[PDB]
Structures are given as structure tokens and as C-alpha cells.
Write a protein that binds this ligand. Structure first.
Ligand SMILES: NC(=O)c1ccc[n+]([C@@H]2O[C@H](COP(=O)([O-])OP(=O)(O)OC[C@H]3O[C@@H](n4cnc5c(N)ncnc54)[C@H](OP(=O)(O)O)[C@@H]3O)[C@@H](O)[C@H]2O)c1
Ligand code: SF4
Ligand code: SF4
Ligand code: SF4
Ligand code: SF4
Ligand code: SF4
Ligand code: FES
Ligand SMILES: [Zn+2]
Lengths: 106, 176, 234, 147, 206, 111, 69, 89
């Protein structure tokens, strides 16, 4: 069995569990008062509970993905890169940038 | 919906491997591909030689422009600048003056064939049905000057096609 | 000055200000046929009908003033049902000249059907036609295209000086003409063609020469006659 | 005297027999130019051969729209052509910019780049009308080199 | 209504949740204005950070967009800030369309979208061609739709439709194709604009 | 500061100097590789008249954009691109060309 | 034209939209051509590069200017 | 009617001492047959019974929008906007 995409369908469990536990710590380094940490954490914790309850079932892969484990692993792989870029460039924690000129209607 | 293009290993063991190898060792499928054109050669070709035979058409077809007139003389074009503004190429130009006394119907009326992308929009926008698109193919010139249509005149010379236009418009009122 | 809210937004207006004059301050133009700039305030069409917050009958914008602090809506449910209806009454006895007609895009009645009036259908059968009225040099007048209003009638009486235009009948036969066969005087009566909303009175010298569509406009002061400024030339 | 007049027509008959056009795929017109290959309306081996080639071809059909980027590109093709060359401006874009025209990029007329002998007015130039362009070309060749 | 209405609003409140969710982060660096109309979402972004907005929506646990496919730009001379580069984004896993806009005048350089999206570099060349907006830290900024000997930027509303260099003669010189000739046929400027306001509620008070 | 562009005031002037050397070396190279056209000496005179029209310098923002454009229209020769003596030619060949005088232009009658 | 060896689609009177391609009924058998005394009685061939062909023409009388002693 | 060589059609001037016209020399210039609107006056006027009459070309098939013409004056017969057809009584 193999996925349709170029990413190889490898039989690996707990691989999703490592990456989802890693990203939670990165979020709790610099932003704390920001809403970015407060909202993303509760989605990841909801997804981690489904992995712990269901043992290698296709129904667990069907939850919020429905394209096997290979597509879900790609969602976790770029999550660490997105969290590190959000930690490096301050945007979520700080808001002080100038407002636009008053015009919008065409 | 899913249909799948991949065969997923047609050969398995012994019998299924040999015939998949036979088509690559010699040819077989190339000889089978040769037979496709072989029967295609015998069946009669659908070919039309233009100076004698003519191709299929329709009751409504757009070609070279020609403006129609009433059965009892009189130019049907009323001069509105209606067809001028709708024209997406801006090929049609119209400047109007009063005709002698009373009547007010046109003076300048040029349709560029250097422009004009052929819509039938000017046929549709016309309330009096002046420009009606006739079944035309024959138009070939030496210059742009000979190609672009002058102040009516050559458009009025569409009388040779107006007999067909009158027949075609009878299939146009209450559309098809 | 008393303030009264129109379409929820509040606008300050004078005590003797008209309803349509108050609407201009809120940046909204009601459908018009009888002028508000210089010509005298008169009814005789009932197009500019607007419904108040608590009123059984709609009042005309030209006649009725605001006076007290009352709410009036321009985009109301009753107003849109009115505006579509009155347009149908105007066009039940209209000669159909639009492609031949001297105006086309410049015509105020032509725009109001597109903007306000009912589009899908118009119930009508058999329209009456009026005989052509006598006119001298300027404005080739056609009585059929006329909607029979009071705009040019008051123009000759007040703005021009010499009165000629009036009423001739009673029903759908009353003409805006002079009734007696006489040519219109010059003075300043050449501007009467520009006043009329319909394509009834339009300059005979530049008739059917160019439509309102495809004409580049430019403003320039006139050389002939002193104290003349701002005149658009196509 | 009589042989001189008759031999001239024999050379003109050689071009009346066969004409090899250039396959320029620079248009929607080019899809109608592919309808010349489509069996229902054919000049294929009646005169037209779809082999084309930049040097061996006698005719070049300028198919539709030409931009200022293709203006030096189509000019050098015309120089590679042999002396008996005929240029057909098939399509309204080729005649003088059917659409666009007043646009910045599209070249008006084609004659500003390459001179045209036969004009075909049609946007979607119907294969029926396209058959005239080749038949008129064959008819236009009447007399060449008297002295 | 049967033929008058296209579709009734039902997903409008569902799409309005996105108008709150991204705004719940609340950056002055990113958010500014959120507009939602006709089953579609529109966001405009402060010039200082465009790349951090594009790294967002890419991946993400709540919404997975990935494809930052189609890229447009708006030319408008009404505002003090001229150009408006508009990103059209599409999701495959989520099935939704969101919009990313820029408000800056951008005659001065703007941050590139090449490190986030691969096909973005080809669209970025078009914006430099037609509009004349330079992208900072861009790999290979080359002319595509413009001519090789073309002056200015072909789309800008400041200059005419015909242009300055457009007509190309051959005439006297044996090989050199002409350029300096400027004259073209007269494009008829239509002054067709209807009296009376077209629609209510769209009217703005002076 | 805002906005960055590339250089600040004095640094922008030396970017033009680096651009001038790169284009000065290409005009002898674009005779044998391209075509003879006019002259090597006359081609170098075309460079000086181009920079005279651009010579104003009030803000580094305007200068920096000219460098990027200068590394494009003058780059249309270095990496070998098709022009066929039609593109990248700046000088008018068929120019009349008109003069600015109240006796020369008024005799022809224009505007 | 006086040609038998070479002939284009310049020939054939008003019948192109009839039995030639579009309509089912034949022009002299079932469906008759309508008379209006406006259409040309004799059919004309293509213009081509030959004399008596198509031409462009001016329309307006222009702005008048006159000077007399 | 024709002036010198070229024939006038729908009110058109040829050339003032041959200056503008030069292209129409080898090739013959076009001319519309009966463009003087002689066929407009050739059609006989129809008698009317009502005060106002509706005009039509030939129903909805032929392009003619409906216009009502008034008949009140005895002198000069009234004609519709689209047709040159006149009505009396
Ligand atoms: N560099 C030089 O050679 C030089 C030096 C000093 C001055 N010039 C002057 O510049 C001019 C150069 O012209 P050119 O020699 O380049 O012209 P050319 O090539 O001889 O071309 C003249 C054309 O006119 C036609 N033609 C001329 N007389 C004709 C006749 N009696 N009957 C029929 N056709 C006729 C010919 O057509 P057919 O071939 O079909 O008959 C020929 O194609 C000369 O007139 C000369 O006075 C030249
Ligand atoms: S062709 Fe029709 S729409 Fe155009 S000016 Fe003539 S009558 Fe009016
Ligand atoms: S067919 Fe289209 S482009 Fe041609 S004249 Fe009519 S409206 Fe214009
Ligand atoms: S008055 Fe106005 S609406 Fe009536 S026919 Fe004339 S242009 Fe059309
Ligand atoms: S001519 Fe015009 S202004 Fe006078 S009454 Fe009639 S519609 Fe009103
Ligand atoms: S003439 Fe029409 S079909 Fe041909 S290239 Fe132009 S737009 Fe396309
Ligand atoms: S517009 Fe107000 S009464 Fe006529
Ligand atoms: Zn009629």
C-alpha cells in the first residue's frame, strides 16, 4: 500500500505524537500573553487524544484529514517551521504598527 | 470520485509474465496498432472540394456585414449610434445628417474589417434590424483600403445576399 | 433651524425648506420631473412621493416641507412600490421614439426607468398621439414625446417673460403647445430645449447630429455675448 | 511568339498545382488553420502540404495576432523565404488588429512588418472562407516576366 | 424570490468565524481591516510584514490552505497610496477561498513571497512589468509580457492605451524595424456614465 | 527607516558608478557578438546622453529604482538575448526630428 | 470571367442559405425567393485585384471655408 | 444624377476639381441602386378610419417598434418615425 503523493506511505505510529508534543513547547517559549498560543494549543490537544484512544485505525486518520497518515504527517512537519518563524518574527505578541490611510470604498 | 489510472502490477506468475514479455521481445501490439490504421484506410473519407462541393452551415451565421432595407424602397437604418457603442472593436462609425426634408437617416457609415471580431452584437442591438449578418465567405483584397467598407454603398451592394438574408431572418423571428 | 433625521442620519435644515432640498444635505437625490434649482415649486406628476415614519399617505417632495422633526426614508418599502408604479403610468401613453428620438442617455425619463421603474414588464395597450406643435427657428418640437408636465409652462411665464405654453385639453389629449399658430420669440427662450427632461423639445440646428453616447465634453466660456461663462461643448 | 506566351502559363501552373504554407501557431486562427487539415474542408495535397519548414515553403500564413516581441521574429522568417513568396493575412487580427488594435503591444496591419498579397477578413475564419484564400492565390498568379 | 436571488446566506455566519479567529490574535503588524461579503473573505495587510502573514494559513492546525496560487494587483490613483497587490488563496483540505491585500503605495520596494510559495516568482515578475513594483530579495526578476525595448510600465493609468512606442515600420532601412513613430488610429472616448446613483447604501457622505 | 529601497543617500550614488562600468565594457562587445550597426565611439556617446536626462538626485528612493531598471534594460545584452537590431535600440533612426523654436515649429503649425 | 478550368465561389445566385448548406427545401422547387424590387436582378462575382472592385470613400461635407473679392 | 464622372448616392460629393479622389480611378467606385429614396414616395398612402393609427412593418418578425401617429391637420399627411408611409383621415 502506498499513497498517491510523492511522500512515501510508511507504517509509523507515535511519529505523529512526537511532532505534536514538540510544537507545544516551542509555543511556550516567547509568546504567553498572545492569543496565537491560546488558540492553537486546544486544537492540538484535541487531536492528540484521538491518537491515544484509537490504535492504528483508519477512522483516526479520517478525523480532520481523510487522506491517510501520510497527509497528517505533512501537517505536523511544517508545523514546527511555522512555530519557529512566528517565534522569531514578532507579530502575535506585539502590536504597535501604524494604521492605514482612510480610504476603502471603490 | 476516483477512477485510478495505475494498473498495479498486471504480471504475477508464469502465465501473466510471459505474454507481457512477448509484447516487448518482438512487437505484437505494434502489429495490433498497425491494424487500426489498416481498416481506417478502407473506409470512405469525408472530404469536400471547395470550388464544386460546399460544407455544412446554419440559418444563423455571421460573415461580411450588409445593411438591409424595406420591401418598398427606403433605407432601414435609422441612425442611432446604438450599434456604435455596443461594438467591442469600435469598427462601426456613424455621423448623421437630415435627409433633404423631413426624414433623418444617416450620412457617414463605415465598418472596418481591419477591426470587427464578429459578434452579431450590432445585429442584436439594432431595433430596426438594419445590419443582418448574411452567409458570407468570399472576401479577399490587395489593400486595407479595398478591405474596409465605405459610406454604406458596398454595404448597400449586399442586395446579392439580401435575398438569402430575407430567407434567414424568417428562421430568426421567434428564435429557432 | 430645526433638525430632522432622514434615513436615520440627522441633517440640519431651514424652517421653510423643502423635503427634496433636505434630502440634498444627506447626499441623496429623489426622482424628479418638476425642478428644484430655479423653476417654481409645483406638483402635477407625483413622482417624488416619499413615505414618512408614521403616515397613511405619501407626500410629494416638491410641495411638502419638513417643518417638524419627522423621520423620512428614501429607500423605504412603500417608496419603491410607488416609484415603480408611477413610471408605468408615465409610459402607458408614450409614443416610443428612443432610437429616433433626439435625446438618448441625456433623457432624464430614460434613466429613471433603468434606476427606479419596473423592468420585467409594462402592461399597456393602445397609446394616444398628439399633433405636432408650431415652432420657429430653434427647437423642433414634437408634442407626442412630451409627458405633459409643468416645467416649460412655468419657464415661459417666469424665466423667459413672454407666456405661450399652457394647457389645451383635459384628459390624455392636453397639449403643451401655444394653441394659436404663432412662432416662439427669441430673447432667452432658446434655452427651453435644454430644460425639458423628455426628447420633445430639442434644438433643430443640431438635431440627430450626435447622440449623448460617444461625445467628449469640455467646459469653456462663450465669446459671443458678454458675461457668458461655463458652456459645455461636445 | 506563341510558344513564349504558353510557356509562361506552364511555370504559373506549377504554383497553381501546389503551395506549401508556413504553420504559424500564433493565434486562435491557427486552430482554424488546423481545420484545413481536418478532412471535411481540405486543400491538403489539393495544393497545401503541412510539412511547412522555414526554407522550403513558398507561402507563409500570418495567423492572427502579432506582438512587438514577435515583430522582429516574423521578419527574419520572411528573409529566409525564396523569391516566389506569397503572404496570406488570415484573420481580422492579421488584417489590422481585429481586436486590441489601439493596444500598446499588438502591431497594427502586419504590413508594417511583412507585405501582404491576400487578405482574409474572418475572426474564426471559417474553413469554407479559408478555402478562398488559397484558390484566390492560385487565380492571382496570371503573368510573370514578359521580357 | 425565485430567479432574482442567486443564493441565500447560510455560510456567511460560518465564514464570519474566520473574521474573528485571525482577528483574535490581534496584530497591528498584520490584521488591520477584515471585510466579508458574498461568501468570501478579504484581508488587507500592513507593508512591514507580508511574509509572516503568508507563513500563516500555510500549514496550521485549524485551517490548512497551502496553495497561495493566483496573484493579482490593483492600479488606483484615488488614494494617496497608489497600488494594491492582491493575493488569491485556495484550500484543498478545507475548501475555502481567502484574500490577502497590501495597502502601501509600493513605489518603494515590498517584501517578496518567493520563500513561501514557489510559483509566486512568476507572478511577481508581472507586477514589476505592468505596474512597476519591485520585490525585495527576489530571485530572477525578468520581463515577460512587456517588450525588450519597452519604456515605462504598460498598465499604469497615467499614460494612454496606445502608448509612446507602439508602431513598427520597415520602409527605408533594409533590416532595422522602426520604433520612434508614435501615431495610431483614434480610440473613441465614450462619456457614457448614467445620471442618478445606481445603488443605495453604497453612497458615502461628503 | 522607511522605506529601505537599497541604499541611503550617498551609497546610492556609488551604485550608479558600478552600473556605469558594467555598461561601458559591453558596448565594444556588442559589435562583434551582435552587429556593427553604427560605431563603437558613437555607442559610448549614447551612454552619456542617457545619464544626463536621469541626472537630478533629490531622494535615494528615486535613485535606487533607476539602478534596478538600469540592471534590466542595459542587461538585455550581457546574458545574450534576442533583439535582432530592433529591441534595445534607444536612438531614433527615422526621427524628423522636431526643434523647439517659435519660427521652426510655428511654420509647420502644431498644437 | 469566361473561365471553365478555374472558378471560385463567386458563382451561384441566392441559394447559399438554401439547398447548398442550411435549408432543406430547394430554391426553385418548394421554397420561393421573396420579391421586393430592391435586390439586384443579375448576380455579381468577387471583387478581387481586378478593375471594378471595392473602394473606400469619404462621407462628411466638412467645415466650410470661403474667401471672395 | 451624376456630376462629371462619379455618381452621387445618398447625398455625397465627388471631388473639387479632382484633388481628394484619386484611388477610384483604376477600380470602379461603388454606388447604391436607388439611393435617392424615390421608392419612399412611390408607395401609396393608406386611408385611416381612426384618429390615431398604429404602424408596423410586418408584425414581430420584421423590425418595427410600435408608434402611434396623430391625424388632425388636413394639410400635410402624418408619417411614422421608421417608415416613409403617410396616412390621411
Ligand atoms: N549607383 C548608380 O548606379 C548611380 C550613379 C549615379 C546616378 N544614378 C542615378 O540613379 C538612378 C538609379 O536607378 P536604378 O538604376 O536603381 O533603377 P533600376 O534598378 O533600373 O529600376 C528602374 C525600374 O523601372 C522600370 N523601367 C524603367 N524604364 C523603363 C521603360 N522604358 N520601360 C519599362 N520599364 C522601365 C524597370 O522595370 P523593368 O525591369 O520591368 O523594365 C526597372 O525595374 C538612375 O536613374 C541614375 O540616373 C545611379
Ligand atoms: S444599424 Fe440599427 S442600431 Fe445601428 S444606427 Fe442603423 S438603425 Fe441604429
Ligand atoms: S460584429 Fe461585433 S465587432 Fe463587428 S461591427 Fe458588429 S458589434 Fe462591431
Ligand atoms: S423621451 Fe426619452 S424615453 Fe421617451 S423615446 Fe425619447 S429618449 Fe426614449
Ligand atoms: S415639453 Fe417637456 S417641459 Fe414642456 S410640458 Fe412637455 S415634458 Fe414638460
Ligand atoms: S482574428 Fe479572431 S480568431 Fe483570429 S487571432 Fe484574432 S481573435 Fe483569434
Ligand atoms: S417631481 Fe416633485 S411633483 Fe413632479
Ligand atoms: Zn412605421
Amino acid at each position: 500500500t502506498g499513497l498517491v503523493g510523492l511522500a512515501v506511505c510508511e507504517t509509523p505510529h507515535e511519529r505523529l505524537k512526537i511532532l505534536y508534543t514538540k510544537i507545544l513547547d516551542v509555543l511556550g517559549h516567547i509568546p504567553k500573553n498572545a492569543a496565537y498560543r491560546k488558540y492553537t494549543e486546544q486544537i492540538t490537544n484535541e487531536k492528540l487524544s484521538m491518537v491515544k484512544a484509537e490504535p492504528d485505525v483508519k477512522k483516526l486518520e479520517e478525523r480532520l484529514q481523510g487522506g491517510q497518515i501520510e497527509e497528517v504527517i505533512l501537517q505536523a512537519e511544517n508545523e514546527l517551521s511555522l512555530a519557529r518563524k512566528m517565534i522569531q518574527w514578532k507579530p502575535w505578541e506585539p502590536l504597535v504598527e501604524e494604521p492605514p490611510a482612510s480610504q476603502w470604498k471603490w | 470520485t476516483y477512477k485510478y489510472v495505475n494498473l498495479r502490477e498486471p504480471s504475477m506468475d508464469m502465465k501473466s509474465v510471459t505474454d507481457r514479455a512477448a509484447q516487448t521481445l518482438l512487437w505484437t501490439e505494434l502489429i495490433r496498432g498497425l491494424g487500426m490504421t489498416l481498416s481506417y484506410l478502407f473506409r470512405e473519407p469525408a472530404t469536400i472540394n471547395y470550388p464544386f462541393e460546399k460544407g455544412p452551415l446554419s440559418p444563423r451565421f455571421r460573415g461580411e456585414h450588409a445593411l438591409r432595407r424595406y420591401p418598398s424602397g427606403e433605407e432601414r437604418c435609422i441612425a442611432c449610434k446604438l450599434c456604435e457603442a455596443v461594438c467591442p472593436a469600435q469598427a462601426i462609425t456613424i455621423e448623421a445628417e437630415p435627409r433633404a426634408d423631413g426624414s433623418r437617416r444617416t450620412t457617414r457609415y463605415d465598418i472596418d474589417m481591419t477591426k470587427c471580431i464578429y459578434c452579431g452584437f450590432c445585429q442584436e442591438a439594432c431595433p430596426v434590424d438594419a445590419i443582418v449578418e448574411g452567409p458570407n465567405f468570399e472576401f479577399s483584397t490587395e489593400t486595407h483600403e479595398e478591405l474596409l467598407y465605405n459610406k454604406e454603398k458596398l454595404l448597400n451592394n449586399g442586395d446579392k445576399w439580401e435575398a438569402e438574408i430575407a430567407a434567414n431572418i424568417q428562421a430568426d423571428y421567434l428564435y429557432r | 433651524l430645526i433638525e430632522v433625521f432622514v434615513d436615520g442620519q440627522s441633517v440640519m435644515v431651514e424652517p421653510g425648506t423643502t423635503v427634496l432640498q433636505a434630502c440634498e444635505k444627506v447626499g441623496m437625490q429623489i426622482p424628479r420631473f418638476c425642478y428644484h434649482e430655479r423653476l417654481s415649486v409645483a406638483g402635477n406628476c407625483r413622482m417624488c412621493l416619499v413615505e414618512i415614519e408614521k403616515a397613511p399617505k405619501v407626500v410629494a417632495a416638491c410641495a411638502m416641507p419638513v417643518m417638524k422633526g419627522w423621520n423620512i426614508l428614501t429607500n423605504s418599502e412603500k417608496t419603491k412600490k410607488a416609484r415603480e408604479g408611477v413610471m408605468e403610468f408615465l409610459l402607458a401613453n408614450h409614443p416610443l421614439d428612443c432610437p429616433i428620438c433626439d435625446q438618448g442617455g441625456e433623457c432624464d425619463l430614460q434613466d429613471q426607468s433603468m434606476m427606479f421603474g419596473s423592468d420585467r414588464s409594462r402592461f399597456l395597450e393602445g397609446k394616444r398621439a398628439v399633433e405636432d406643435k408650431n415652432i420657429g427657428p430653434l427647437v423642433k418640437t414634437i408634442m407626442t414625446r412630451c409627458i405633459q408636465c409643468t416645467r416649460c409652462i412655468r419657464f415661459a411665464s417666469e424665466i423667459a417673460g413672454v407666456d405661450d405654453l399652457g394647457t389645451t385639453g383635459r384628459g390624455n389629449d392636453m397639449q403643451v403647445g401655444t394653441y394659436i399658430e404663432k412662432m416662439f420669440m427669441s430673447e432667452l427662450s432658446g434655452n427651453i430645449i435644454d430644460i425639458c427632461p423628455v426628447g420633445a423639445l430639442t434644438x433643430x440646428x443640431x438635431x440627430x447630429x450626435x447622440x449623448x453616447x460617444x461625445x467628449x465634453x469640455x467646459x469653456x466660456x462663450x465669446x459671443x455675448x458678454x458675461x457668458x461663462x461655463x458652456x459645455x461643448x461636445x | 511568339e506563341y510558344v513564349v506566351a504558353k510557356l509562361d502559363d506552364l511555370i504559373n501552373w506549377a504554383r497553381r498545382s501546389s503551395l506549401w504554407p508556413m504553420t504559424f501557431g500564433l493565434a486562435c486562427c491557427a486552430v482554424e488553420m488546423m481545420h484545413m487539415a481536418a478532412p471535411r474542408y481540405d486543400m491538403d495535397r489539393f495544393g497545401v502540404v503541412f510539412r511547412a519548414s522555414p526554407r522550403q515553403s513558398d507561402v507563409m500564413i500570418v495567423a492572427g495576432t502579432l506582438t512587438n516581441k514577435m515583430a522582429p521574429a516574423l521578419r527574419k522568417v520572411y528573409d529566409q523565404m525564396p523569391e516566389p513568396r506569397y503572404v496570406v493575412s488570415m484573420g481580422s487580427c492579421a488584417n489590422g488588429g481585429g481586436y486590441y488594435h489601439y493596444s500598446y503591444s499588438v502591431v497594427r496591419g502586419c504590413d508594417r512588418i511583412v507585405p501582404v498579397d491576400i487578405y482574409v477578413p474572418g475572426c474564426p475564419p471559417t474553413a469554407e472562407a479559408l478555402l478562398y484564400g488559397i484558390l484566390q492565390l492560385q487565380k492571382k498568379i496570371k503573368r510573370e516576366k514578359r521580357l | 424570490r425565485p430567479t432574482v436571488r442567486p443564493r441565500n446566506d447560510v455560510a456567511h455566519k460560518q465564514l464570519s468565524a474566520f473574521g474573528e479567529y485571525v482577528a483574535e490574535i490581534l496584530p497591528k503588524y498584520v490584521q488591520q481591516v477584515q471585510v466579508s461579503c458574498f461568501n468570501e473573505l478579504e484581508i488587507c495587510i500592513h507593508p512591514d510584514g507580508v511574509i509572516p502573514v503568508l507563513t500563516f494559513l500555510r500549514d496550521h492546525s485549524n485551517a490548512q490552505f497551502k496553495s497561495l496560487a493566483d496573484l493579482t494587483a490593483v492600479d488606483i490613483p484615488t488614494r494617496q497610496n497608489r497600488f494594491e497587490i492582491v493575493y488569491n488563496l485556495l484550500s484543498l483540505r478545507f475548501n475555502s477561498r481567502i484574500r490577502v491585500k497590501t495597502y502601501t503605495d509600493e513605489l518603494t520596494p515590498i517584501e517578496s513571497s518567493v520563500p513561501v510559495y514557489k510559483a509566486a516568482n512568476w507572478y511577481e515578475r508581472e507586477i514589476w512589468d505592468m505596474f512597476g513594483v519591485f520585490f525585495a530579495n527576489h530571485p530572477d526578476l525578468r520581463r515577460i509580457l512587456t517588450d525588450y525595448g519597452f519604456e515605462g510600465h504598460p498598465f499604469r493609468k497615467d499614460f494612454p492605451l496606445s502608448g509612446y512606442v507602439e508602431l513598427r515600420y520597415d520602409d527605408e532601412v533594409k533590416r532595422v524595424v522602426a520604433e520612434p513613430v508614435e501615431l495610431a488610429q483614434e480610440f473613441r472616448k465614450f462619456d457614457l456614465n448614467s445620471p442618478w446613483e445606481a445603488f443605495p447604501a453604497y453612497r458615502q457622505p461628503p | 527607516v522607511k522605506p529601505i529601497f537599497s541604499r541611503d543617500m550617498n551609497e546610492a550614488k556609488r551604485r550608479v558608478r558600478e552600473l556605469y562600468r558594467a555598461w561601458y565594457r559591453e558596448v565594444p562587445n556588442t559589435v562583434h557578438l551582435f552587429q556593427l550597426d553604427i560605431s563603437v565611439k558613437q555607442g559610448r556617446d549614447k551612454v552619456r546622453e542617457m545619464f544626463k536626462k536621469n541626472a537630478h538626485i533629490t531622494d535615494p528612493r528615486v535613485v535606487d529604482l533607476l539602478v534596478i531598471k538600469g540592471k534590466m534594460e542595459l542587461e538585455e545584452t550581457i546574458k545574450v538575448w534576442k533583439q535582432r537590431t530592433h529591441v534595445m535600440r534607444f536612438f531614433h533612426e527615422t526621427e524628423a526630428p522636431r526643434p523647439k523654436d517659435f519660427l521652426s515649429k510655428f511654420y509647420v503649425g502644431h498644437d | 470571367k469566361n473561365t471553365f478550368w478555374d472558378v471560385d465561389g463567386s458563382m451561384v445566385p441566392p441559394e447559399w442559405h438554401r439547398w447548398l448548406h442550411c435549408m432543406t427545401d430547394d430554391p426553385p422547387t418548394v421554397k420561393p425567393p421573396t420579391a421586393r424590387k430592391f435586390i439586384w436582378t443579375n448576380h455579381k462575382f468577387n471583387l478581387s485585384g481586378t478593375p471594378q472592385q471595392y473602394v473606400p470613400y469619404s462621407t462628411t461635407r466638412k467645415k466650410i471655408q470661403e474667401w471672395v473679392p | 444624377x451624376x456630376x462629371x464622372x462619379x455618381x452621387x448616392x445618398x447625398x455625397x460629393x465627388x471631388x473639387x476639381x479632382x484633388x481628394x479622389x484619386x484611388x477610384x480611378x483604376x477600380x470602379x467606385x461603388x454606388x447604391x441602386x436607388x439611393x435617392x429614396x424615390x421608392x419612399x414616395x412611390x408607395x401609396x398612402x393608406x386611408x385611416x378610419x381612426x384618429x390615431x393609427x398604429x404602424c408596423d412593418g410586418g408584425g414581430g418578425a420584421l423590425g418595427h417598434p410600435r408608434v402611434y401617429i396623430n391625424l388632425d391637420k388636413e394639410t400635410k399627411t402624418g408619417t411614422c418615425g421608421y417608415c416613409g408611409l403617410q396616412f390621411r383621415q
